[PDB]
Write an enzyme that holds these catalytic residues in place. Sequence first.
Site, short mmCIF file in Angstrom:
data_model
loop_
_atom_site.label_atom_id
_atom_site.label_comp_id
_atom_site.label_asym_id
_atom_site.label_seq_id
_atom_site.Cartn_x
_atom_site.Cartn_y
_atom_site.Cartn_z
N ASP A 180 10.54 -4.30 -7.76
CA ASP A 180 9.93 -5.03 -6.72
C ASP A 180 10.71 -6.20 -6.57
O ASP A 180 10.64 -7.19 -7.42
CB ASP A 180 8.58 -5.47 -7.22
CG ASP A 180 7.78 -6.49 -6.33
OD1 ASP A 180 8.49 -6.98 -5.37
OD2 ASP A 180 7.16 -7.30 -6.89
N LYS A 192 14.68 -13.98 0.49
CA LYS A 192 14.10 -12.86 0.92
C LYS A 192 13.64 -13.23 2.50
O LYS A 192 13.50 -12.31 3.41
CB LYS A 192 13.07 -12.38 0.16
CG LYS A 192 12.29 -10.91 0.74
CD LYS A 192 11.42 -10.44 -0.39
CE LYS A 192 10.69 -9.24 -0.09
NZ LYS A 192 9.66 -8.36 -0.95
N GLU A 221 6.19 -1.77 0.14
CA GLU A 221 5.37 -2.54 -0.98
C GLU A 221 4.09 -2.01 -0.87
O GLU A 221 3.52 -1.54 -2.03
CB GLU A 221 5.54 -3.86 -0.80
CG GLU A 221 6.96 -4.66 -1.47
CD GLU A 221 7.15 -5.81 -0.95
OE1 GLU A 221 6.21 -6.66 -0.43
OE2 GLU A 221 8.37 -6.27 -0.74
N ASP A 250 -2.33 -7.85 0.19
CA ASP A 250 -1.18 -8.31 -0.64
C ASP A 250 -1.05 -10.01 -0.67
O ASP A 250 -0.53 -10.44 0.32
CB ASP A 250 0.21 -7.57 -0.41
CG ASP A 250 1.33 -8.04 -0.87
OD1 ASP A 250 1.41 -9.04 -1.79
OD2 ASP A 250 2.03 -7.08 -1.36
#
Length: 367
Positions: free
Chosen positions: A8, A66, A168, A189
Amino acid sequence: YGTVIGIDLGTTYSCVAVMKTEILANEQGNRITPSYVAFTDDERLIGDAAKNQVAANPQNTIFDIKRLIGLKYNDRSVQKDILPFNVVNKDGKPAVEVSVKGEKKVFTPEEISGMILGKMKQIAEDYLGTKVTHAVVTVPAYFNDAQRQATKDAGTIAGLNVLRIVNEPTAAAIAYGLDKKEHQIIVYDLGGGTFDVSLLSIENGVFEVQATSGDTHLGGEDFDYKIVRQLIKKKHGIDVSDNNKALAKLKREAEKAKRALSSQMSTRIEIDSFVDGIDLSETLTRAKFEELNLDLFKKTLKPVEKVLQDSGLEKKDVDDIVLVGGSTRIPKVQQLLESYFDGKKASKGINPDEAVAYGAAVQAGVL
């Protein structure tokens, strides 16, 4: 393929796992590793070491890369995100500029992510006692080809053949065994920096991303910042708003205080000593934490609503709810989501910080 690992690669924290699926702890014993890289004159720092010195070295400590990976420099999100470190335009793409030994160094987001992925591989190699050559790496569902390819290229830089790029939410559902009578799955999430809602359909082991929504600038750190503001505000005549060294201390403790209030009704926040030589000593109730963050908690339900109507679904059509991210531990967050789904309880059993890497490793073990 050797032993294929699951990674991850997150915005604020990264996580490694291998197949029984085990989450791997770093050299400092932490099962999650900050997505941080720092550049000093003596050495290159990755993870905890980088994050712990961010206050002292803000210009040469890179985070939130990211947010820039696979995107163009002229993109509106990139221009928005451009922060304490220099971001330059390298061939139409955002690149970070640091200074080591009096000379400038330019690194791409692929290279920076490759340093983080390098660290994750080294953890796995110590865990296994063998070399690691192949990995399954996760990305958000809304990531396009360029962002997915840039994540693959980051693997190559780390000496990893990224066999699969997995979403994800799908990885989280895989972790809970929801891949194994059609089902509709909501993935909620709430990470450190970003918030993602996905509706997945699982058919005969086949996942499809039916709808996605959320907030790229709502996360755990935003709940932490509300605690920091409270600690800043009176007993002494010192405003620490301009003191970045003291602010970094507060962020650490505010992160710990949020974690404690997920299990406890009260927490002791103490720094001995905070500024100059004076102690900071404050009590924070769960009720006060909820009060300060209630608007931010309720705002998370809007993307959940948007996901349901962008699909052809009602609340009752949802078969499973998966919680991802540290902030899903917060009892108020769970309460608001449960009552939104009319008492429907979410899946539990896996640490919400480790669920994505868990599922990445499961798919890695199948090759």
